Design an enzyme around this catalytic site. Structure first.
Site, PDB file in Angstrom:
ATOM      1  N   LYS A   1     -13.500  -7.976 -11.126  1.00 34.19           N
ATOM      2  CA  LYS A   1     -14.240  -8.698 -10.098  1.00 34.19           C
ATOM      3  C   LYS A   1     -15.438  -9.285 -10.835  1.00 34.19           C
ATOM      4  O   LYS A   1     -16.273  -8.555 -11.360  1.00 34.19           O
ATOM      5  CB  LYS A   1     -14.697  -7.744  -8.994  1.00 34.19           C
ATOM      6  CG  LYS A   1     -13.558  -7.251  -8.110  1.00 34.19           C
ATOM      7  CD  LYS A   1     -14.028  -6.181  -7.138  1.00 34.19           C
ATOM      8  CE  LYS A   1     -12.938  -5.824  -6.139  1.00 34.19           C
ATOM      9  NZ  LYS A   1     -11.683  -5.389  -6.808  1.00 34.19           N
TER      10      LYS A   1
ATOM     11  N   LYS B   1       0.828  -1.197   0.000  1.00 35.99           N
ATOM     12  CA  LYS B   1       0.000   0.000   0.000  1.00 35.99           C
ATOM     13  C   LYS B   1       0.866   1.252   0.000  1.00 35.99           C
ATOM     14  O   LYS B   1       1.867   1.324   0.715  1.00 35.99           O
ATOM     15  CB  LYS B   1      -0.899   0.004   1.237  1.00 35.99           C
ATOM     16  CG  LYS B   1      -1.701   1.279   1.419  1.00 35.99           C
ATOM     17  CD  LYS B   1      -2.584   1.202   2.652  1.00 35.99           C
ATOM     18  CE  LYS B   1      -3.400   2.474   2.818  1.00 35.99           C
ATOM     19  NZ  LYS B   1      -4.366   2.361   3.950  1.00 35.99           N
TER      20      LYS B   1
END
Ligand SMILES: [Mg+2]
Length: 342
Positions: free
Chosen positions: A244, A148
């Protein structure tokens, strides 16, 4: 031939081991809708919905999906179909509600396929570099690490590059960067970054930096629908797309999406979102279709207890999956006289 004779709704809501805290939402538990379709021979098949309790992520919610699937069943119950292809035709009218469609498709798919046991590559995700995180990386030896973006990014990559194993490095900036991050973004390009997910909330900011002086750009939060993904690819320098399945409408829409996106010059990575063991299995199953290893979450990462156990167990750098068998005692009726609270 097959006919659907019954439909039941259930809920599962386990707490996240670590509370989820993001700009968009705070999640203590992962409320999840499950459906059960029973055919004319009394065979039950389950589907896991990826919608959340509220619309913090998408306009479809557990409640909206429940209503959509409930009406869908009323319109398709007792109708006979002999093939997977024929079964899918019954959900063509649900393309406007992809989350609901995907839930039904997950169940339908099981009615026509022999599910295999298989593994997928383990990709680790680090939001920082605590001792716990670092020790996990050293012990598990992932082939990919998604770090991150934080103010410590370069100081952390320096530590990661001293690990005794090679790995692909992905950075996730969570739509949080600004003009002051350009210099570091360009410096990051010299660190062999496979791709950086969502550097800017405003994608037009990409036109402000020299093309090729920053890592390949990936869409994640912005990969909302096939049509929108294509529009963004045609306008901005996008090379990777995190897809997704539920956002596309389900398992059956993945391959076509992948083929279309590749024709536009983009690579695909299949990903999931806070899934329980049932949906996790199917996301992992589809992972191999991607250009890069899929973003599959390991079993137990989020939840201590799961509805499907041993779904994605980490073993020597890979996540192992078995045909998913829902533990019905873990599910609770969604509503009605049998929905109890204590
Ligand atoms: Mg991301």
């Amino acid at each position: 031939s097959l006919k659907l004779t019954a439909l039941h709704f259930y809920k599962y809501s386990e707490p996240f081991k670590s509370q989820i805290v993001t700009p968009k939402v705070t999640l203590t538990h992962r409320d999840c809708l499950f459906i059960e379709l029973i055919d004319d021979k009394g065979n039950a098949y389950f589907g896991e919905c990826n919608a959340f309790q509220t619309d913090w992520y998408d306009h479809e919610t557990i409640a909206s999906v429940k209503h959509v699937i409930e009406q869908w069943f009323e319109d398709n119950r007792n109708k006979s179909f002999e093939t997977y292809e024929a079964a899918l035709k019954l959900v063509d009218s649900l393309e406007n509600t992809p989350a609901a469609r995907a839930t039904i498709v997950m169940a339908l798919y099981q009615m026509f396929h022999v599910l295999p046991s298989f593994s997928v590559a383990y990709g680790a995700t680090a939001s920082g570099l605590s001792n716990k995180q670092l020790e996990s990386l050293k012990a598990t030896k992932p082939t990919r690490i998604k770090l991150k973006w934080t103010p410590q990014i370069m100081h952390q990559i320096r530590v990661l590059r001293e690990l005794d194993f090679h790995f692909q490095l992905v950075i996730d900036a969570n739509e949080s960067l600004d003009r002051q991050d350009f210099t570091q973004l360009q410096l990051l390009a010299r660190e062999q970054v496979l791709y950086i997910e969502e550097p800017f909330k405003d994608i037009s900011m990409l036109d402000e930096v020299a093309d090729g002086t920053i890592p390949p750009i990936a869409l994640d939060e912005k990969a909302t629908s096939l049509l929108d993904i294509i529009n963004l690819i045609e306008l901005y320098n996008v090379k990777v797309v995190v897809l997704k399945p539920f956002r596309l409408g389900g398992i059956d829409k993945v391959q076509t999406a992948i083929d279309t996106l590749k024709s536009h010059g983009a690579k695909v990575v299949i990903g999931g979102m806070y899934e329980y063991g049932l949906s996790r299995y199917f996301t992992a199953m589809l992972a191999r279709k991607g250009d890069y290893p899929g973003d599959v979450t390991p079993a137990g990462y989020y939840f201590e207890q799961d509805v499907v156990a041993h779904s994605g167990i980490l073993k020597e750098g890979r996540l192992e999956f078995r045909p998913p068998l829902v533990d019905i005692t873990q599910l609770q009726p969604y509503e009605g006289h049998h929905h109890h609270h204590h």
